[PDB]
Design a protein around this ligand. Structure first.
Ligand SMILES: *[C@@H]1O[C@H](CO)[C@@H](O[C@@H]2O[C@H](CO)[C@@H](O[C@@H]3O[C@H](CO)[C@@H](O)[C@H](O)[C@@H]3O)[C@H](O)[C@H]2NC(C)=O)[C@H](O)[C@H]1NC(C)=O
Lengths: 220, 8
């Protein structure tokens, strides 16, 4: 497929970088990030969806608020739940709370969820190139916690489904002097990494990034 | 088949 892609360049399709605070809710920022882009790509509307709703309400889908979750599961939740409210009506508190979802306030909806075949990074490249930014999970080690900039490459991480522990959003890809990489949006604030983003080597299922990826197909 | 992933 194309040599490089970047949804931020194509238009106003990628929302600003957010911060999960001290709650392990990255899976929710990866979910909203994917859905915000999908809705903007399909309708041109740029919304900011409530991650707190997922933290307080998605337990029926094997999610655990500040203790973890998976984007595919959160996409299914939004789907059956019939909607997710905006950030302005269900504010991010950053802590496990009681669900306050109001059906009349839902602004974004999911029709279906596409789950990338386990470990199929090429398929992930196609999804990013052709359809939407992709949510994925990978194993973060101490090596990565020292990251400042550049193409992250490591020998310490594993590529197995039971090792992935952080959820992020692939917004594009490219290569530099033969080294292919992914442009990834994080939710640790804009002061982390490269203005809130990071590059990671592509083509090696680096840290298991292709083990559990998914993207939503919105109901618009 | 769904994603049986560790909680990320
Ligand atoms: C992609 O992976 C996700 C995560 O493993 C799969 O999510 C599961 O999706 C099914 C529907 O295909 C959900 O079942 C439905 O649950 C609701 C609520 O309980 C119920 O009302 C429906 O009748 C139905 O049983 C299931 O909850 C969900 N599981 C989790 C843990 O979120 C999804 O199936 C995968 N998609 C594909 C195409 O493989």
């Amino acid at each position: 497929y194309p040599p490089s892609m970047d949804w931020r360049k194509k238009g106003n399709f990628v929302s600003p970088v957010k911060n999960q605070g001290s709650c392990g809710s990255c899976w929710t920022f990866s979910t909203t990030g994917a859905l915000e882009s999908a809705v903007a790509i399909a309708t041109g509307k740029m919304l900011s969806l409530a991650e707190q709703q997922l933290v307080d309400c998605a337990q029926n889908f094997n999610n655990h608020g500040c203790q973890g979750g998976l984007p595919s599961q959160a996409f299914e939740y939004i789907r059956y739940n019939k909607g997710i409210m905006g950030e302005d009506t269900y504010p991010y508190k950053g802590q496990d709370d009681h669900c306050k979802f109001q059906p009349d306030k839902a602004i974004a909806f999911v029709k279906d969820v596409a789950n990338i075949t386990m470990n199929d990074e090429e398929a992930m490249v196609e999804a990013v190139a052709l359809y939407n930014p992709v949510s994925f999970a990978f194993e973060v080690t101490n090596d990565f916690l020292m990251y400042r900039k550049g193409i992250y490459s490591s020998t310490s991480c594993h590529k197995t489904p039971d090792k992935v522990n952080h959820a992020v959003l692939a917004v594009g890809y490219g290569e530099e002097n033969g080294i292919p990489y992914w442009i990834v949006k994080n939710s640790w604030g804009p002061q982390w990494g490269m203005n809130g983003y990071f590059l990671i080597e592509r083509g090696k299922n680096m840290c298991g990034l292709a083990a559990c990826a998914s993207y939503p197909i919105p109901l618009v | 088949e769904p994603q049986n992933c560790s909680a990320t």
